[PDB]
Amino acid sequence: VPQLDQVVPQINVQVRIQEVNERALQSLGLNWRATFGGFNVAVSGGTGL
């Protein structure tokens, strides 16, 4: 009995959960159309020449 009735420790536990996210985007595009004699040229990004 003296051993099973002793004081046991009391504790406080701290947990920290930390989460960080970052992003970065960068677009750039030229999209033209030229018309000289007889010719018709169109340059884009989706379709090419």
């Binding site: 051993q3 099973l4 002793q6 046991v8």
Partner: peptide, 29 residues
Amino acid sequence: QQATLIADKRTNSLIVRGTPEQVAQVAEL
């Protein structure tokens, strides 16, 4: 037989109860 084992979760105590030979075997483990 085999020695009686008593486990207390609150105090983390192991209690072995048996013949003196059966108790010295747990004591060395």
